[PDB]
CSV table of C-alpha atoms in Angstrom, one decimal:
chain,number,residue,atom,x,y,z
A,235,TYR,CA,-13.1,-5.8,6.5
A,236,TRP,CA,-12.0,-6.5,9.9
A,237,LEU,CA,-15.3,-5.6,11.8
A,238,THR,CA,-18.6,-4.9,11.3
A,239,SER,CA,-19.9,-0.9,12.0
A,240,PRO,CA,-23.1,0.4,13.6
A,241,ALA,CA,-24.4,1.2,10.2
A,242,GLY,CA,-23.8,-2.7,9.3
A,243,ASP,CA,-21.1,-1.5,6.5
A,244,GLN,CA,-18.0,-3.7,5.9
A,245,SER,CA,-15.5,-1.6,8.5
A,246,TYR,CA,-11.8,-1.3,9.2
A,247,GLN,CA,-10.4,0.5,12.2
A,248,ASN,CA,-6.6,1.9,11.9
A,249,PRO,CA,-4.0,0.8,14.2
A,250,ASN,CA,-1.8,3.8,13.2
A,251,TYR,CA,-5.2,6.2,14.1
A,252,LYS,CA,-5.5,6.2,18.2
A,253,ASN,CA,-1.9,6.5,18.2
A,254,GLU,CA,0.5,8.7,20.7
A,255,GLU,CA,-0.5,12.2,20.3
A,256,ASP,CA,-3.5,10.9,17.9
A,257,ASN,CA,-5.4,13.9,16.1
A,258,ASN,CA,-8.4,15.0,18.0
A,259,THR,CA,-10.9,14.2,15.3
A,260,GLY,CA,-9.8,12.4,12.4
A,261,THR,CA,-11.4,11.5,8.6
A,262,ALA,CA,-12.9,8.0,7.6
A,263,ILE,CA,-13.4,6.7,4.4
A,264,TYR,CA,-16.3,5.8,2.3
A,265,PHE,CA,-16.0,3.8,-0.5
A,266,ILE,CA,-19.0,2.8,-2.2
A,267,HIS,CA,-19.8,0.6,-4.9
A,268,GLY,CA,-21.7,0.9,-8.5
A,269,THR,CA,-25.2,-1.4,-9.1
A,270,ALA,CA,-24.4,-4.7,-9.4
A,271,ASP,CA,-20.5,-4.0,-8.8
A,272,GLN,CA,-18.7,-6.8,-7.2
A,273,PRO,CA,-17.6,-5.4,-3.6
A,274,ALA,CA,-14.8,-7.7,-3.5
A,275,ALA,CA,-12.7,-5.9,-5.8
A,276,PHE,CA,-13.6,-3.1,-3.9
A,277,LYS,CA,-12.1,-4.6,-1.4
A,278,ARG,CA,-9.3,-5.7,-3.0
A,279,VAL,CA,-8.8,-1.2,-3.8
A,280,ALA,CA,-9.0,-1.0,-0.1
A,281,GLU,CA,-6.4,-3.6,1.3
A,282,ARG,CA,-3.8,-2.3,-1.7
A,283,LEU,CA,-4.4,1.1,0.2
A,284,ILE,CA,-3.8,-0.5,3.9
A,285,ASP,CA,-0.8,-2.5,1.9
A,286,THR,CA,0.5,1.3,0.7
A,287,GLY,CA,0.2,2.8,4.3
A,288,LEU,CA,-2.7,5.2,5.7
A,289,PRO,CA,-2.0,8.1,7.6
A,290,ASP,CA,-2.4,8.1,10.8
A,291,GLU,CA,-4.7,10.9,10.9
A,292,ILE,CA,-6.8,8.6,8.7
A,293,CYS,CA,-10.2,7.7,11.1
A,294,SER,CA,-11.7,3.6,10.0
A,295,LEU,CA,-12.0,3.0,6.3
A,296,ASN,CA,-16.2,1.4,5.2
A,297,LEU,CA,-17.3,-0.4,3.1
A,298,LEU,CA,-21.0,0.1,1.4
A,299,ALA,CA,-21.9,-3.3,1.2
A,300,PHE,CA,-23.9,-5.7,2.9
A,301,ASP,CA,-26.9,-3.4,5.5
A,302,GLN,CA,-28.0,-2.2,3.7
A,303,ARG,CA,-27.6,-2.6,-0.2
A,304,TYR,CA,-30.2,-3.3,-3.4
A,305,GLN,CA,-30.1,-3.4,-6.8
A,306,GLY,CA,-32.7,-0.9,-8.3
A,307,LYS,CA,-33.9,2.6,-6.7
A,308,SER,CA,-32.9,5.8,-6.7
A,309,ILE,CA,-30.0,7.8,-6.3
A,310,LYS,CA,-31.5,10.3,-3.9
A,311,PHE,CA,-32.4,7.2,-1.6
A,312,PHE,CA,-29.4,5.9,-1.9
A,313,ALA,CA,-27.3,9.0,-0.9
A,314,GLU,CA,-29.9,9.3,2.1
A,315,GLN,CA,-29.1,6.1,3.3
A,316,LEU,CA,-25.3,7.2,2.7
A,317,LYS,CA,-26.0,9.9,5.3
A,318,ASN,CA,-27.5,7.6,7.7
A,319,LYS,CA,-25.1,5.3,7.8
A,320,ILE,CA,-22.7,8.0,8.5
A,321,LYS,CA,-24.8,9.1,10.9
A,322,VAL,CA,-24.6,5.9,12.7
A,323,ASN,CA,-21.2,5.9,12.4
A,324,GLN,CA,-20.6,9.7,14.2
A,325,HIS,CA,-18.5,9.9,11.4
A,326,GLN,CA,-17.5,13.8,10.6
A,327,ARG,CA,-15.0,14.7,7.7
A,328,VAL,CA,-15.5,12.1,5.6
A,329,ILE,CA,-13.9,11.0,2.3
A,330,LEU,CA,-16.0,9.3,0.0
A,331,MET,CA,-14.6,6.9,-2.7
A,332,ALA,CA,-17.3,5.4,-5.6
A,333,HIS,CA,-17.8,3.9,-8.2
A,334,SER,CA,-19.3,4.3,-11.9
A,335,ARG,CA,-23.1,5.1,-10.8
A,336,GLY,CA,-22.2,5.0,-7.0
A,337,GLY,CA,-19.9,7.9,-7.7
A,338,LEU,CA,-23.6,10.3,-8.5
A,339,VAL,CA,-24.7,9.0,-5.4
A,340,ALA,CA,-21.9,10.0,-3.3
A,341,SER,CA,-21.9,13.5,-5.5
A,342,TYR,CA,-25.5,14.5,-4.2
A,343,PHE,CA,-24.8,13.1,-1.1
A,344,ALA,CA,-21.7,15.6,-1.3
A,345,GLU,CA,-23.6,18.4,-2.8
A,346,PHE,CA,-26.9,19.0,-1.2
A,347,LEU,CA,-27.2,16.6,2.2
A,348,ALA,CA,-23.8,16.6,3.9
A,349,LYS,CA,-23.6,20.8,4.4
A,350,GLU,CA,-26.8,20.7,6.8
A,351,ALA,CA,-26.4,17.7,8.4
A,352,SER,CA,-23.2,18.9,8.9
A,353,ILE,CA,-20.5,16.3,7.9
A,354,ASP,CA,-17.4,17.3,6.0
A,355,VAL,CA,-16.6,16.2,2.5
A,356,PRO,CA,-13.0,17.0,1.4
A,357,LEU,CA,-12.2,14.5,-1.0
A,358,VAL,CA,-14.5,13.2,-3.4
A,359,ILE,CA,-12.8,10.4,-5.9
A,360,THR,CA,-15.2,8.8,-8.5
A,361,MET,CA,-14.2,6.3,-10.8
A,362,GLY,CA,-15.8,6.0,-14.1
A,363,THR,CA,-18.6,7.8,-12.8
A,364,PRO,CA,-21.4,8.8,-15.9
A,365,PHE,CA,-21.3,12.5,-14.8
A,366,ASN,CA,-22.6,13.5,-18.5
A,367,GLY,CA,-24.9,10.5,-19.1
A,368,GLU,CA,-33.1,6.4,-15.1
A,369,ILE,CA,-31.3,9.7,-14.1
A,370,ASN,CA,-32.9,13.0,-15.5
A,371,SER,CA,-30.5,15.3,-17.7
A,372,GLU,CA,-31.6,18.0,-16.1
A,373,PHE,CA,-30.7,16.2,-12.5
A,374,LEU,CA,-27.3,15.8,-13.9
A,375,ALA,CA,-26.9,19.3,-15.7
A,376,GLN,CA,-27.9,21.1,-11.6
A,377,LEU,CA,-25.6,18.5,-9.9
A,378,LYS,CA,-22.5,19.6,-12.2
A,379,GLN,CA,-23.5,22.6,-11.5
A,380,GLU,CA,-23.5,22.7,-8.1
A,381,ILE,CA,-19.7,20.3,-8.7
A,382,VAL,CA,-18.2,23.3,-10.8
A,383,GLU,CA,-19.3,26.6,-9.5
A,384,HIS,CA,-20.5,25.8,-5.5
A,385,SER,CA,-18.9,22.5,-4.3
A,386,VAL,CA,-16.2,22.9,-1.6
A,387,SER,CA,-15.6,19.2,-1.9
A,388,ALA,CA,-12.0,18.2,-4.3
A,389,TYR,CA,-13.3,15.8,-7.2
A,390,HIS,CA,-10.9,14.0,-8.6
A,391,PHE,CA,-11.8,11.6,-12.0
A,392,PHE,CA,-10.5,8.8,-12.7
A,393,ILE,CA,-10.7,7.3,-16.4
A,394,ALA,CA,-9.0,5.0,-19.0
A,395,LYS,CA,-7.5,6.6,-21.5
A,396,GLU,CA,-10.6,5.0,-24.2
A,397,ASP,CA,-13.1,7.2,-22.1
A,398,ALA,CA,-10.6,10.0,-22.0
A,399,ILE,CA,-10.3,10.2,-25.6
A,400,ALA,CA,-13.9,9.1,-26.8
A,401,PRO,CA,-15.6,12.0,-28.4
A,402,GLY,CA,-17.3,13.9,-25.2
A,403,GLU,CA,-16.7,13.4,-21.5
A,404,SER,CA,-17.1,10.4,-19.9
A,405,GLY,CA,-16.3,10.0,-15.6
A,406,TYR,CA,-15.2,13.4,-15.8
A,407,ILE,CA,-16.7,17.0,-16.1
A,408,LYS,CA,-14.7,19.2,-18.7
A,409,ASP,CA,-15.3,22.4,-16.5
A,410,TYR,CA,-14.2,21.2,-13.4
A,411,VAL,CA,-11.2,19.7,-15.3
A,412,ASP,CA,-10.4,22.8,-16.8
A,413,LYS,CA,-10.8,24.5,-13.1
A,414,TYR,CA,-9.0,22.0,-11.6
A,415,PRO,CA,-6.4,19.7,-14.1
A,416,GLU,CA,-4.7,17.8,-11.3
A,417,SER,CA,-8.5,16.0,-10.7
A,418,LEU,CA,-8.3,14.3,-13.4
A,419,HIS,CA,-6.6,10.5,-13.7
A,420,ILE,CA,-6.3,8.9,-16.8
A,421,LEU,CA,-4.9,5.0,-15.8
A,422,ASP,CA,-3.9,2.7,-18.5
A,423,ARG,CA,-6.4,-0.5,-18.5
A,424,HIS,CA,-4.1,-3.2,-20.5
A,425,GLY,CA,-6.8,-5.9,-19.4
A,426,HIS,CA,-10.7,-4.7,-19.8
A,427,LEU,CA,-12.4,-4.5,-17.5
A,428,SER,CA,-9.9,-3.3,-14.6
A,429,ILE,CA,-10.0,-0.3,-13.4
A,430,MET,CA,-9.8,-1.3,-10.2
A,431,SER,CA,-7.6,-3.6,-10.1
A,432,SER,CA,-4.4,-1.1,-11.4
A,433,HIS,CA,-2.0,-0.3,-9.2
A,434,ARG,CA,-1.4,2.9,-10.3
A,435,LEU,CA,-5.2,3.8,-8.9
A,436,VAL,CA,-4.2,3.3,-5.5
A,437,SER,CA,-1.0,5.1,-5.5
A,438,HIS,CA,-3.0,8.0,-7.2
A,439,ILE,CA,-5.3,7.7,-4.3
A,440,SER,CA,-2.7,6.8,-1.5
A,441,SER,CA,-1.1,10.8,-2.4
A,442,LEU,CA,-4.4,12.1,-2.5
A,443,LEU,CA,-4.8,11.3,0.8
A,444,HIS,CA,-0.7,11.9,1.8
A,445,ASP,CA,-1.5,15.0,0.0
A,446,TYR,CA,-4.4,16.4,1.8
A,447,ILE,CA,-3.1,15.0,5.2
A,448,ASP,CA,-0.3,16.9,4.9
A,449,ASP,CA,-2.3,20.5,4.7
B,270,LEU,CA,30.6,12.2,-28.6
B,271,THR,CA,30.4,12.5,-32.4
B,272,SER,CA,28.5,10.4,-34.7
B,273,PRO,CA,30.7,9.8,-38.5
B,274,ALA,CA,27.2,12.3,-39.7
B,275,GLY,CA,29.2,14.6,-37.6
B,276,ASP,CA,25.9,15.1,-35.2
B,277,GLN,CA,25.9,15.0,-31.4
B,278,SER,CA,26.5,11.2,-29.9
B,279,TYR,CA,26.6,9.4,-26.8
B,280,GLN,CA,28.1,5.9,-27.1
B,281,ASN,CA,26.9,2.9,-25.1
B,282,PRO,CA,30.1,1.8,-22.5
B,283,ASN,CA,29.0,-2.0,-22.3
B,284,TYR,CA,28.6,-1.5,-26.1
B,285,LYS,CA,27.5,-4.9,-27.7
B,286,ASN,CA,30.0,-8.1,-27.5
B,287,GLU,CA,32.9,-8.7,-29.8
B,288,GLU,CA,31.0,-11.1,-32.1
B,289,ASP,CA,27.4,-8.8,-32.8
B,290,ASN,CA,27.5,-9.3,-36.7
B,291,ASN,CA,24.3,-6.7,-36.8
B,292,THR,CA,26.3,-3.1,-36.9
B,293,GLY,CA,23.2,-2.1,-34.4
B,294,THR,CA,20.0,-0.4,-33.5
B,295,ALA,CA,20.6,3.5,-33.6
B,296,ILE,CA,18.3,6.3,-31.5
B,297,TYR,CA,17.6,9.2,-33.9
B,298,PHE,CA,16.3,12.5,-32.3
B,299,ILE,CA,14.6,14.7,-34.7
B,300,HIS,CA,13.3,18.2,-33.4
B,301,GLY,CA,11.4,21.3,-35.0
B,302,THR,CA,12.3,24.2,-35.9
B,303,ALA,CA,14.3,26.7,-33.1
B,304,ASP,CA,13.9,23.8,-30.1
B,305,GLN,CA,16.3,23.6,-27.7
B,306,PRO,CA,18.4,20.8,-27.8
B,307,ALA,CA,19.1,20.7,-24.4
B,308,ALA,CA,16.0,19.3,-23.3
B,309,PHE,CA,16.8,16.5,-26.1
B,310,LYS,CA,20.7,16.3,-24.2
B,311,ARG,CA,18.4,15.5,-20.5
B,312,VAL,CA,15.7,12.7,-21.8
B,313,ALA,CA,18.8,11.3,-23.7
B,314,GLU,CA,20.6,11.5,-20.1
B,315,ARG,CA,17.8,10.2,-18.3
B,316,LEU,CA,17.4,7.1,-21.0
B,317,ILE,CA,21.2,6.6,-20.1
B,318,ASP,CA,20.3,7.3,-16.0
B,319,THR,CA,17.5,4.2,-16.6
B,320,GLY,CA,19.7,2.4,-18.4
B,321,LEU,CA,19.1,1.2,-22.6
B,322,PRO,CA,19.7,-1.8,-23.7
B,323,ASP,CA,23.1,-3.7,-23.8
B,324,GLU,CA,21.8,-4.2,-27.7
B,325,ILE,CA,21.1,-0.8,-28.6
B,326,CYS,CA,24.2,0.7,-30.4
B,327,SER,CA,24.2,4.5,-29.5
B,328,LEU,CA,22.1,7.2,-28.7
B,329,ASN,CA,21.9,9.5,-31.5
B,330,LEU,CA,20.8,13.8,-31.9
B,331,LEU,CA,19.4,14.3,-35.3
B,332,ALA,CA,17.8,17.8,-37.1
B,333,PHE,CA,20.6,20.0,-36.2
B,334,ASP,CA,21.6,21.6,-39.3
B,335,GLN,CA,20.0,23.1,-40.0
B,336,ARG,CA,16.4,24.6,-39.0
B,337,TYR,CA,15.0,26.8,-41.5
B,338,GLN,CA,11.6,29.2,-41.0
B,339,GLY,CA,10.3,28.0,-44.1
B,340,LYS,CA,11.3,24.9,-45.7
B,341,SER,CA,9.4,21.8,-45.9
B,342,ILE,CA,9.0,18.9,-44.3
B,343,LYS,CA,10.0,17.3,-46.9
B,344,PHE,CA,13.5,18.7,-47.2
B,345,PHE,CA,14.4,18.0,-43.5
B,346,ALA,CA,13.1,13.9,-44.1
B,347,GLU,CA,15.5,13.4,-46.8
B,348,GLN,CA,18.1,15.3,-44.5
B,349,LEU,CA,17.8,12.8,-41.8
B,350,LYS,CA,17.4,9.4,-44.4
B,351,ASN,CA,21.2,11.1,-45.7
B,352,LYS,CA,22.8,11.3,-42.6
B,353,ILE,CA,21.4,7.7,-41.1
B,354,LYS,CA,23.0,6.1,-44.3
B,355,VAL,CA,26.0,8.4,-43.8
B,356,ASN,CA,26.3,6.3,-40.5
B,357,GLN,CA,25.5,2.7,-42.2
B,358,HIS,CA,23.1,2.1,-39.4
B,359,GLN,CA,19.7,-0.6,-39.6
B,360,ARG,CA,16.6,-0.8,-37.8
B,361,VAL,CA,16.9,2.5,-36.2
B,362,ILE,CA,14.3,4.3,-33.4
B,363,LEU,CA,13.0,7.3,-34.3
B,364,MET,CA,12.0,9.5,-31.2
B,365,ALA,CA,10.8,13.1,-32.5
B,366,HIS,CA,9.1,16.0,-30.9
B,367,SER,CA,5.9,18.7,-32.7
B,368,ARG,CA,6.4,19.4,-36.2
B,369,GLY,CA,10.1,17.4,-36.4
B,370,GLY,CA,7.5,13.9,-35.6
B,371,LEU,CA,5.8,14.3,-38.9
B,372,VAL,CA,9.3,14.5,-40.3
B,373,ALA,CA,10.6,11.5,-38.9
B,374,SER,CA,6.7,9.7,-39.5
B,375,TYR,CA,7.1,11.2,-43.1
B,376,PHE,CA,10.1,9.4,-43.3
B,377,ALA,CA,9.2,6.1,-41.8
B,378,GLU,CA,6.6,6.0,-45.2
B,379,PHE,CA,8.2,6.5,-48.0
B,380,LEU,CA,11.9,7.5,-47.7
B,381,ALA,CA,13.2,4.0,-45.3
B,382,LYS,CA,11.8,1.8,-48.1
B,383,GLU,CA,13.9,3.6,-50.7
B,384,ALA,CA,16.5,3.4,-48.0
B,385,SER,CA,16.2,-0.6,-47.2
B,386,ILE,CA,16.7,1.3,-43.7
B,387,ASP,CA,14.1,-0.9,-41.4
B,388,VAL,CA,12.1,2.0,-39.0
B,389,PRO,CA,11.0,-0.4,-36.3
B,390,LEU,CA,9.6,2.7,-33.6
B,391,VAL,CA,8.3,5.7,-34.8
B,392,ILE,CA,7.6,7.8,-31.6
B,393,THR,CA,5.6,11.2,-32.0
B,394,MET,CA,5.3,13.7,-29.1
B,395,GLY,CA,2.8,16.5,-29.3
B,396,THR,CA,2.9,15.9,-33.0
B,397,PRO,CA,0.0,17.5,-34.8
B,398,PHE,CA,-1.1,15.4,-37.4
B,399,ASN,CA,-4.2,17.1,-37.4
B,400,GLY,CA,-3.2,20.2,-38.3
B,401,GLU,CA,2.4,25.5,-46.0
B,402,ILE,CA,1.7,21.9,-45.5
B,403,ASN,CA,-1.7,20.5,-47.1
B,404,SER,CA,-4.1,19.4,-45.0
B,405,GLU,CA,-5.2,17.0,-47.6
B,406,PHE,CA,-1.0,15.8,-47.3
B,407,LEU,CA,-1.7,15.4,-43.7
B,408,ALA,CA,-4.8,13.2,-44.3
B,409,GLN,CA,-2.5,11.2,-46.5
B,410,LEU,CA,0.3,10.6,-44.2
B,411,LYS,CA,-2.4,9.5,-41.8
B,412,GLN,CA,-4.1,7.0,-43.9
B,413,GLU,CA,-0.3,5.7,-44.7
B,414,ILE,CA,0.0,5.8,-40.5
B,415,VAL,CA,-3.3,3.6,-40.1
B,416,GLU,CA,-3.4,1.2,-42.9
B,417,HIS,CA,0.2,1.0,-44.9
B,418,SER,CA,2.6,1.5,-42.4
B,419,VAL,CA,4.5,-1.6,-40.8
B,420,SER,CA,5.9,0.8,-38.4
B,421,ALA,CA,5.2,0.9,-34.8
B,422,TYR,CA,4.2,4.2,-33.8
B,423,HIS,CA,3.5,5.3,-30.2
B,424,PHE,CA,2.2,9.1,-29.8
B,425,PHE,CA,3.2,10.4,-26.5
B,426,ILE,CA,0.3,13.6,-24.9
B,427,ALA,CA,-0.3,15.2,-22.4
B,428,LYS,CA,-3.7,14.9,-20.6
B,429,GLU,CA,-5.2,18.1,-21.5
B,430,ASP,CA,-4.3,17.1,-25.0
B,431,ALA,CA,-6.3,13.9,-24.6
B,432,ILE,CA,-9.4,15.4,-22.8
B,433,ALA,CA,-9.2,18.1,-25.6
B,434,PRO,CA,-11.9,17.9,-28.8
B,435,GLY,CA,-10.5,16.2,-31.9
B,436,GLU,CA,-7.0,14.6,-32.4
B,437,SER,CA,-4.0,16.7,-30.8
B,438,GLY,CA,-1.0,14.5,-31.1
B,439,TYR,CA,-2.3,11.0,-32.1
B,440,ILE,CA,-4.4,9.8,-34.8
B,441,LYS,CA,-7.5,8.3,-33.1
B,442,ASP,CA,-7.2,5.3,-36.5
B,443,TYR,CA,-4.3,3.9,-35.0
B,444,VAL,CA,-5.1,4.1,-31.7
B,445,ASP,CA,-8.4,1.7,-32.1
B,446,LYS,CA,-5.9,-0.6,-34.2
B,447,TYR,CA,-3.8,-0.3,-31.2
B,448,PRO,CA,-4.6,1.1,-27.7
B,449,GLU,CA,-0.9,0.7,-26.3
B,450,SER,CA,0.4,3.1,-29.0
B,451,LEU,CA,-1.3,5.9,-26.9
B,452,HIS,CA,0.7,7.3,-24.2
B,453,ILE,CA,-1.2,10.1,-21.7
B,454,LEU,CA,1.5,11.9,-19.3
B,455,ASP,CA,0.4,14.0,-16.5
B,456,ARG,CA,2.3,17.2,-17.5
B,457,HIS,CA,2.9,19.1,-13.7
B,458,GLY,CA,5.3,21.7,-14.7
B,459,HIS,CA,3.3,23.7,-18.1
B,460,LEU,CA,4.0,23.5,-20.5
B,461,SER,CA,7.0,21.4,-21.3
B,462,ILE,CA,6.3,17.4,-21.7
B,463,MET,CA,8.9,16.3,-22.5
B,464,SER,CA,10.1,16.7,-19.7
B,465,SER,CA,8.0,14.1,-17.2
B,466,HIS,CA,10.2,11.4,-16.2
B,467,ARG,CA,7.5,9.2,-17.2
B,468,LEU,CA,7.7,9.6,-20.8
B,469,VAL,CA,11.3,8.6,-20.6
B,470,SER,CA,10.8,5.9,-18.3
B,471,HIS,CA,8.0,4.8,-21.0
B,472,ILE,CA,10.6,5.1,-23.8
B,473,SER,CA,12.8,2.4,-21.9
B,474,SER,CA,10.7,-0.1,-21.1
B,475,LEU,CA,9.2,0.2,-25.0
B,476,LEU,CA,13.0,-0.1,-25.9
B,477,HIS,CA,12.9,-3.3,-23.6
B,478,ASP,CA,10.2,-4.8,-25.1
B,479,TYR,CA,11.5,-4.1,-28.5
B,480,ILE,CA,14.8,-5.7,-28.1
B,481,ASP,CA,13.4,-8.7,-26.5
B,482,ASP,CA,11.5,-9.5,-29.6
């Protein structure tokens, strides 16, 4: 955005942060893209988040592009790289916003790598992430069990209505949605394929950040 | 106010100009048996708060006399058509709830032609299309809705019903035909989908689209 982070990722520093009576240790947001996804649209989502207004509590906004993104490579490796980049930036209490396959990566990071890395992950937001389904089905099932039962992160699945009524669970975990109804967000896409172009998305995300911050 | 049929009605204060030769598009509310009319009053009132198009004559409140426990949808639809023509209204918009939606939509498929009353919009809220009433009969109504119908159908459901397996409150074939026909509303307060303001807003913007055309 504004500047480049130590990890090489694009970064936006919050003017609201570091204000008078600033939070002692804040929360940084990380924006992860799926494979072969345009980072510029994802920057559209972050810029619109800034336009809406970010809580003073939020440290910075980070973008997982540039150094270093591969086209093809294993899930575990990408999550390990995400953890490495978070540790290079010395961030704590990171909020993850991921798209498509990237949501798997973030979720893997949030479920195994994050605790013994001593990184808190309060919010994990996934947009069209194929949890139900290359990636193994056993791995998907074990990840879903970790998300439903043991996870300490709040998961929010953003999908399109066509995927909602589509048979099966696409972009969301039915068990988790049943446990937490407010986790599922269904967005009207009039023009395909623009889930991230909706302003309802940014509105819900900003309301999620505010809800988490007020608590 | 009271409508010509005797039902509870709200007249538009702006209404229309003097030289409208159209008598006027009237909105009709069909509820299932033993349902609370006051929630329907709030949804109509909220439509008024948001703003109703000047071309639309009035907001009218139907299915009223008399909710019987075991009488067929067909009887209520015949009663509805009688009440609509008592008011001589034309190109009326139907907004119906639960089994009442079947009534309205049943009316839209057979009785409306014999009345020579146009039904441009038929709006169904949590209407059990998939399922006394025959299941074969529901399938025939669904086929008539999908293929032959000339009314615009809009299905309002909650996200819980959306992700529920099967077709709940909506016809999948019609949604494939028209994606914009399906409206999924977040239901914060269980279990009253008709209560969100997002529903009534969708109705008002739908009315604006219909009036402009």
